[PDB]
């Protein structure tokens, strides 16, 4: 008699063609990446209670040079910037990881004169350059192409005219756009075609 006893399809295919004792625990842990010794609490197994935190490696502080008072006074001095005016920039640099689209917005415009993004960037960069220059001799790569502010002030600007163009220059420009082809076709398809026809009729 047919043994079967299993699933119909599988059966036909086969025959027709013959204690955990690992207690988790609510646990205190200190993050070695912190300097304040703050104790937090965590949901860890029993077998790892006491190991160091695995998220302290995700702490790569952005590097920013730290000029000293003497050093600043000698070389970083700038007639248009005061020390109170310059230390603030680097503090914002560090607290915002050396990003200058968010350093600007939080600039202290009450004690401080209004600066664009480009001037702040150039200022911090000349400061970094001269900080490394105090070293210089210790192979301090005096080849730094510090951010161009002039060309770049422009380059910011000559995007802005093209940013807010309600029609014409956004719309009507299509015309001139097509003209780029026409101006690049019909002139040579004109003066050159004429000269070729003059030679062709000269030989003719």
């Amino acid at each position: 008699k047919r043994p079967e006893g299993m699933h119909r399809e599988v059966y036909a295919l086969l025959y027709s063609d013959k204690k955990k004792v690992r207690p988790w625990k609510w646990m205190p842990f200190t993050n070695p990446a912190r300097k304040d010794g703050a104790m937090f609490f965590h949901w860890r197994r029993a077998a790892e209670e006491g190991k160091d935190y695995p998220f302290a490696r995700f702490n790569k502080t952005v590097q920013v040079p730290v000029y000293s008072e003497q050093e600043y006074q000698l070389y970083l001095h700038d007639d248009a910037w005061t020390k109170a005016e310059t230390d603030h920039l680097f503090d914002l640099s560090r607290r915002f990881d050396l990003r200058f689209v968010v350093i600007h917005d939080r600039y202290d415009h009450q004690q401080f004169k209004k600066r664009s993004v480009e001037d702040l960037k150039e200022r911090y960069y000349h400061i970094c350059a001269k900080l490394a220059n105090v070293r210089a001799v210790p192979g301090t790569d005096l080849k730094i192409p510090v951010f161009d502010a002039g060309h770049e002030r422009r380059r910011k600007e000559q995007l802005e005219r093209l940013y807010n163009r309600t029609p014409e220059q956004v719309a009507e420009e299509e015309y001139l756009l097509q003209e780029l082809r026409k101006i690049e076709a019909r002139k040579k398809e004109r003066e050159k075609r004429s000269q070729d026809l003059q030679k062709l009729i000269t030989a003719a």
Binding site: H7, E9, V10, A12, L13, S16, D17
Partner: protein, 96 residues
């Protein structure tokens, strides 16, 4: 207004990338890889079709599919194909 045409390229690269992690496959070679799949699909389905019709049956089944794979693929080719499919049907009806 699109005219999209289907092909097997997405699953022949899953299987190839898995059975040759470092080896790629050219577009022209994937065309052959697609035509091969469609050809064998046609062959096995046609033989299962005939199998069902010979026994006066209106339905092509996986049992007929296995017998068509026994008829189509040569000895080893068959054995491996039959084993692979047979084990894929018991991994599917066990609700995994």
């Amino acid at each position: 207004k699109r005219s999209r045409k289907e092909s097997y390229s997405v699953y022949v690269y899953k299987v190839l990338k898995q059975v040759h992690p470092d080896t790629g496959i050219s577009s022209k070679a994937m065309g052959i890889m697609n035509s091969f799949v469609n050809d064998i699909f046609e062959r096995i389905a046609g033989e299962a079709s005939r199998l069902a019709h010979y026994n006066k049956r209106s339905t092509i089944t996986s049992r007929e599919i296995q017998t068509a794979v026994r008829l189509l693929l040569p000895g080893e080719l068959a054995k491996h194909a039959v084993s692979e499919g047979t084990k894929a049907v018991t991994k599917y009806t066990s609700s995994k």
